[model samples]
Target: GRLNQRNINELKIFVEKAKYYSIKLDAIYNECTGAYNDIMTYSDQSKVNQAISIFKKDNKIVNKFKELEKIIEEYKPMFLSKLIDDFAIELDQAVDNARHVADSYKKLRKSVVLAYIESFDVISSKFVDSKFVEASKKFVNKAKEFVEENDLIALECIVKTIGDMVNDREINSRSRYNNFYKKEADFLGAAVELEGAYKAIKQTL
Candidate 1:
């Protein structure tokens, strides 16, 4: 449990890093769009050039989004490991079922011995017949059938691929928006991936 806490603490730290870039990306989107609005409506040539300048610097800003995604990937396995342990109770329940089967089997075997002892009529110094032995034998056989069927078999894959899901959503959505605003679209795409990544980790916590 202490290890799980440590893993979750580290995961929080990484998500913090992801959120950092996401905010930066969001700011860049806002700034770029504001500048574009200025360029489209401004009659002054100097203002148009300044808006173009803001657009050109975006390549460098986008790198921060890539770095954010890398942080998420770096912590992916760490969170995966913790999530597996977090949901391990489901696995343990399967093992617990096997234990119950074994316990019942032992009790049924003991019942058969008691049934044999029951056949002796100590007070009358005579033997009697009882179907308890047959009943217990049937129960023990049925228990073995369950034992044969007891063999049984997530978090890792969800945390691993959820970013890609958001990535697809961004691509599909980008097409619907005006291409002139593609940089803003791109910013949103990166920010959305971070949101998905951060949410996925937070849910596990």
Candidate 2:
């Protein structure tokens, strides 16, 4: 292995950090799903309508995506600089995987926001005079329909691919010479912020 003992130890520390970041990401994703479930299953039309408005204005999720984008852009060069002759090919692939995942994350954020905007429009205009239950039904159905129209499963798979690449090669394998270890703190900090955003949303649910 090209990795020295010190490098191995550094990677070990990063791997542990990655573990928690991954867990936090999972929690954030789950919070959105939980909110969806709440809207879909709640019997009270007025309550569901109010929750939809809350979710629409919840700019924290949008801001988190922007922050994650900034973090990736800032640290990606450090990640890129590590792609030397010995490991350049695999390192490039890993970075590409991360790029796609980040782009997909942005797309998911956009689609969700679009869903909210469209649902809110239905409530504000087309269904304004409709009964509360009927308007709520339209809002919920628009939310579900927009989400269903997107490539959600593909986005999910690529996110997993990037995550696995980070875990299996960047941080966990001694033979792999990636410098993600140096990015440990930034990654963890971003994860902490993301978790905080999601936790707030979860509390709202």
Candidate 3:
């Protein structure tokens, strides 16, 4: 009877520990809701769209909630380290996705410049004429140096590459506006990450 009581007491403590983890996970998840919504808003929707396909197979942001449900049901304190590690790994993947967005943004910037050039005239274009990258870097450095070292017309040189290219709304919305907008938003949306998860777990410990 004494041994059984000890076992029951231990189980109670473990159950409470699981409850504690659940609360922590739920809190962190809620805080990340906005950022996660942004990623879903812009990035991937194919899996989410097919969530009801076959035997309930899905692999996307929302799936994480389901995975946690199963884990909590079978959860043991012994399984904790791996669980937190999984969260960290997933967070790293999210960071990589953000980095991808930044890269896509770079591509978009270059693409817009191309569209702007063709929108006008190839031959008549005298500025940004052939090589504008070198000019962009020079101007960027100059613009920063204006504050970093305080300069004059040298800072103005940066804006020369940009040269007042106004948005032609018709051309902007002409074709692939959806994809262009999606990646930019994805970049902005994936904000929460491993450190936030790690710190939250640490507090529980």
Candidate 4:
């Protein structure tokens, strides 16, 4: 029921490392949103040729994004497996030390306790990374896998996933605003102008 200072220090170290990994995980999610956008919009060519050209430059970037996504997928299962192993090791050591300490052995028990504390640090660090990676991997992998499998249901799920990843509130509000102003702006600026030019050319006949 009580932990020595060594156990406390080990927990503190593990917490710091966990925080660092959480930040990194958030960054990965942000990048994933961009990667999803690149994939979704990459096929559209109706914009001006110059705008389309600019978008094409992101082809390599999108390719690299996909590569990173695959790397995350392959490595994540391995990461979760390692975390389970490490946590079991640490938990067993902690139980053993508790038993030994109750049997009138202080020094050997202390040594085992210290070892368990260090193992706890390892376990905590691995668990934090593993959990976040697993979540992100599942989110990204299902969509990509669905597309690969050519399942329309899965493809629709991917769109939903993207919307969820970006969150609904912002997307909904922006969609409404864009529908009112942005669509008309584009129509008045480019669509209408192009239509008028075609009509003028046709009327000459």
Candidate 5:
């Protein structure tokens, strides 16, 4: 009773001041899946055409052409798998961050503000931001290895997705840690930017 009375005000303030959970995580999950498949589908067709559309006897680099085909095929699963695994991991950590924040709040014997800041650090930084930030960097390098230009275009959506997640995480982390409106407008503004990026990436039914 004592703890709840003390911590409840801080909890309420975070939800109001930050609007931290304003962006729906599940919608982000769907956006990730929807946009990924569409772009990759276009990549699939474009790469196949580039590989096997003609005999190329007059061009006389058929062996080299075959090499290009093999390169795209082998690399497809590797990067695609990377795309999926990283996404799934990020989603999992997002859930963990939300849950940790909700569950950690309690009436503290000491300073309530300190309790909130410590929770924000552990929940946002240690759990959420750290996970996808590394994944985003790794995906950037993998993107460079894509052989076909079309495949690169499509697969690069994954790059956008990962990068956006980091942006979303960083903005929210900073927004919540501050007292009020310090970054008030930016958190949801970044979410809007992310939504636009996801829409541009969504290329399929």
Candidate 6:
């Protein structure tokens, strides 16, 4: 049956809103990439914990990405009708693989930390290879310096990126998934808010 003009107008409005939200989503993705790159650059062999933290942060962001994508998929038919394309499918698959990679890294980091802690005595023994001990000590010192110098700036940028992501996701969720999708929204919102609180706490830096 042919739709009335009112329904057609409503559909048009939804499509326009979807397009706007899509552009904003892409912006959030770009900001996330920038933040991830910045944090990963600080990850060195000795600063394993810092690297792990970066991976964990990136993993959470990827989860948010997936959540937003799911909403897009749910409303795709209503918004795009018969305009399905391979590009969308490929993008979805790529994001899925990224999520898996991030998850694997998180687990690997945990395992490495546990192993290091378990062997702490042997690893720290003075009789262990002098060269290895020397290098390890130097690396630790460097990590301390790096953290003391640039940590605040790096964290600030990360927090700002997250704020942008939360705003983007909030808009996407409300438009496509309704207010009832509160759990996912609240989780991401809390992360961004915590980052904000950290920003304020570290203002002295």
Give TM-scores for every candidate, taking all chains together and pairing residue i with residue i.
0.26, 0.28, 0.28, 0.23, 0.19, 0.26
The sequence of per-residue lDDT tens digits that candidate 2 reaches over residues 1-205 is 2323333333334334333333333444665554445555663766555434433344544444344333233222232223222132332343333223233333454443333333333322322223323433443343344334433332232233224433443222221224333433333333333334323332333
Q: Which stretches of candidate 2 lie over 4 Å from their true place?
A: 1-21, 41-44, 74-205
Model 6, span 141-167: residue lDDT tens: 333333234332222222233334324
Worst 10 residues of 4 by lDDT: 100-109
Every model: Cα RMSD to truth: 30.3, 24.7, 26.9, 26.8, 22.8, 24.5
After superposition, which runs of candidate 6 have C-alpha atoms over 4 Å from their true positions? 1-13, 16-20, 38-43, 46-52, 75-205
Per-residue C-alpha lDDT of model 3 across residues 34-102, encoded as one tens digit per residue: 444444455545432322221122334334433434434433223333443454454445443332332
lDDT values, one for every candidate: 0.35, 0.36, 0.31, 0.32, 0.30, 0.35
By TM-score, how accurate is candidate 3? 0.28
Evaluate residue 34 in candidate 2 and report its C-alpha lDDT on the 0 to 100 scale.
44
Clashing pairs in 2: none
Clash counts per candidate, in order, are 0, 0, 1, 0, 0, 0
- For model 1, name the residue pairs that clash: none
Write one digit per residue (lDDT tens) for candidate 5, span 1-205: 3433333333334334323221322222233333334333544654423322221223322233223223233222233334333433443453333222112211110112222223323222221223323432333333333212223222223223334443333323233324343333333444444434333323221
Q: Over the stretch 26-143, how does candidate 1's per-residue lDDT look in tens digits?
A: 4545565666576557738677566555544544433443443354554332333333332233324433332232233233322222221122112112101123223323333333
Candidate 4 vs candidate 6, lDDT winner? 6
Q: Per-residue lDDT for 67-144 in model 4, tens only?
A: 333323322333333433343343345333322211222222222222222333343333233333344344333333
Clashing residue pairs in candidate 5 (N, C-alpha, C atoms within 3 angstroms): none
Question: Where in model 1 is the C-alpha error above 4 Å?
Answer: 38-53, 73-205
Model 3 scores a C-alpha lDDT of 0.31
- Residue pairs in candidate 4 whose N, alpha carbon or C atoms collide under 3 angstroms: none
